[PDB]
Amino acid sequence: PQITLWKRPLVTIKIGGQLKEALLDTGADDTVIEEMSLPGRWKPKMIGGIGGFIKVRQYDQIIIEIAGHKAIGTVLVGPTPVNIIGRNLLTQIGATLNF
Amino acid sequence: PQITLWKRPLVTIKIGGQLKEALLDTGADDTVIEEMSLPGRWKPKMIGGIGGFIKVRQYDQIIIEIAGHKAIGTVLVGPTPVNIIGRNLLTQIGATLNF
Ligand SMILES: CC(C)c1nc(CN(C)C(=O)N[C@H](C(=O)N[C@@H](Cc2ccccc2)C[C@H](O)[C@H](Cc2ccccc2)NC(=O)OCc2cncs2)C(C)C)cs1
Numbered sequence: 390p391q392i393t394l395w396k397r398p399l400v401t402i403k404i405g406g407q408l409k410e411a412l413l414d415t416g417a418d419d420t421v422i423e424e425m426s427l428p429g430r431w432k433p434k435m436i437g438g439i440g441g442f443i444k445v446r447q448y449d450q451i452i453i454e455i456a457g458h459k460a461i462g463t464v465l466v467g468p469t470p471v472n473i474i475g476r477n478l479l480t481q482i483g484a485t486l487n488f
Numbered sequence: 489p490q491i492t493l494w495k496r497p498l499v500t501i502k503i504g505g506q507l508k509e510a511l512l513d514t515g516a517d518d519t520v521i522e523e524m525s526l527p528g529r530w531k532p533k534m535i536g537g538i539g540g541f542i543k544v545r546q547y548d549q550i551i552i553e554i555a556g557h558k559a560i561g562t563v564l565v566g567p568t569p570v571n572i573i574g575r576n577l578l579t580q581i582g583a584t585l586n587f
């Protein structure tokens with residue numbers, strides 16, 4: 390598919406057995422998902438945006454479907470106002486920016 | 489070009505006649521450049537992301553070249569951690585996400 394950028398590039402994702410909306414974000418190294426009770430072990434992390442740092446929980450090897458494309462990798466969970474799919478998962482679904 | 493996402497999608501920009509590197513950022517509504525001297529009028533603004541808000545100088549109608557492609561639009565100048573080209577200018581250069 391092709392997604393234009395006139396509005397935020399939001400798609401449906403499936404994570405943890407839940408459907409959510411998330412932003413496809415070429416400017417994010419990592420994937421940051423809103424607070425959710427994912428099972429299993431995690432590691433504390435701090436990540437920085439414009440603005441400063443926030444505390445997140447790093448979960449590894451998390452299965453996630455992005456606009457129908459299955460992916461597996463690290464997901465950072467914490468208090469974000471928007472779910473962000475970053476390059477660690479965008480590469481897995483073969484996404485490019487084109488102009 | 490087609491830009492893959494294994495690496496950060498950094499490109500060279502020309503702004504105020506100066507070369508800088510900036511990140512092509514589909515998750516950003518706006519374009520935010522590090523503190524610099526820039527010709528043109530400005531007004532104070534705030535912009536936010538992960539970590540909270542920062543104060544910026546909003547410059548409208550600024551001529552900028554992004555990877556060799558011309559855009560003319562709003563540039564926010566302030567203490568951003570990295571130079572970001574957001575959707576307001578990615579749309580001008582005809583960028584899309586594809587997978
Ligand atoms: C729900 C509501 C609050 C929303 N507002 C918006 C519109 N807004 C404010 C933005 O787009 N704001 C932008 C932004 O930070 N966008 C963000 C998503 C977001 C939006 C709002 C609230 C929280 C997160 C998404 C952006 O790609 C930023 C860009 C960035 C890159 C490196 C260093 C600093 C910043 N990426 C990150 O936050 O993580 C970046 C990481 C740092 N180093 C490598 S990756 C820019 C202006 C910089 C979208 S959703």
Ligand SMILES: [Cl-]
Pocket residue numbers: 395396397
């Ligand atoms: Cl939008």
